[PDB]
Amino acid sequence: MELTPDQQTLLHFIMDSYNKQRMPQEITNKILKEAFSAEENFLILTEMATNHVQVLVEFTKKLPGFQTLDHEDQIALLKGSAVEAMFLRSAEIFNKKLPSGHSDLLEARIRNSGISDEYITPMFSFYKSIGELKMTQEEYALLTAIVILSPDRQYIKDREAVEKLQEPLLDVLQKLCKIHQPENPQHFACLLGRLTELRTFNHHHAEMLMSWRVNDHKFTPLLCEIWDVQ
Amino acid sequence: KDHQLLRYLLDK
Numbered sequence: 001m002e003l004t005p006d007q008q009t010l011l012h013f014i015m016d017s018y019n020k021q022r023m024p025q026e027i028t029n030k031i032l033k034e035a036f037s038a039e040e041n042f043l044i045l046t047e048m049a050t051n052h053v054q055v056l057v058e059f060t061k062k063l064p065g066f067q068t069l070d071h072e073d074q075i076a077l078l079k080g081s082a083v084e085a086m087f088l089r090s091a092e093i094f095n096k097k098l099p100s101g102h103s104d105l106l107e108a109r110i111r112n113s114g115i116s117d118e119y120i121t122p123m124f125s126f127y128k129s130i131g132e133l134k135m136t137q138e139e140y141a142l143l144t145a146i147v148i149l150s151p152d153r154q155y156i157k158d159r160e161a162v163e164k165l166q167e168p169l170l171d172v173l174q175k176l177c178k179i180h181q182p183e184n185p186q187h188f189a190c191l192l193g194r195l196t197e198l199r200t201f202n203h204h205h206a207e208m209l210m211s212w213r214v215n216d217h218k219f220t221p222l223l224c225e226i227w228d229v230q
Numbered sequence: 231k232d233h234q235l236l237r238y239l240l241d242k
């Protein structure tokens with residue numbers, strides 16, 4: 001039911017930390033302004049992803065109790081969640097309301113960005129499923145935090161310590177789903193359902209990057225560490 | 231050295 005004073009504090013703190021990200025307009029204005037080559041689009045992708053990972057590390061460090069975790073587990077959580085968080089943020093940006101015709105042009109411009117056909121349908125299928133859930137900013141923020149604090153990540157030594165940090169975020173999100181969408185009592189389950197779909201992008205992320213219609217696939221040293229490319 | 235940049239950003 002209603003959020004407690006502790007949960008409201010948690011929610012507002014996660015919101016402020018989440019709001020430090022690059023604005024959706026910065027990305028969409030660039031894409032909608034003019035059509036770029038596959039080469040220019042690969043560079044836009046690479047800089048967007050480098051800024052995303054940097055901001056993600058800062059958001060992750062502020063997560064209550066994250067700094068108390070074992071340093072090797074901290075690296076394993078960051079590495080295991082970076083691609084999923086990126087796709088969750090791109091899904092949020094894709095679904096931000098824009099003037100008439102803009103979302104159709106944005107979709108067509110992403111389709112002709114240089115990415116291989118094979119990866120277009122599962123990516124847009126996920127974006128449209130996120131869109132139908134009519135998620136609030138708070139839901140995206142909490143869901144990102146939950147993705148990062150996933151105990152079921154590979155190489156996690158102490159799963160229980162991670163579970164203790166994720167549980168209060170799941171409790172807040174569940175209350176928010178019951179408050180935002182009382183007509184749909186399947187909303188919380190629906191949201192956790194989307195998280196299971198996010199994980200599939202992890203498997204073929206390297207191939208969707210390498211299949212980009214460019215001659216050279218240049219990645220930054222930070223991207224190489226987090227994406228296991230080069 | 232496997233996650234050198236990541237370890238650095240995490241510690242800082």
Ligand SMILES: COc1ccc(-c2nc3ccccc3n2[C@H](C(=O)Nc2c(C)cccc2C)C2CCCCC2)c(OC)c1
Nearest residue numbers: 041044045048049052086087089090093094110113115208
């Ligand atoms: C691996 O293959 C792709 C292909 C396309 C996208 C993608 N889906 C988008 C949906 C809405 C808006 C922009 C969208 N992007 C790109 C983008 O910037 N993603 C992004 C990143 C990288 C970090 C933070 C935040 C975002 C949005 C544009 C990169 C330049 C060419 C056109 C796509 C993608 O994102 C995960 C991965």
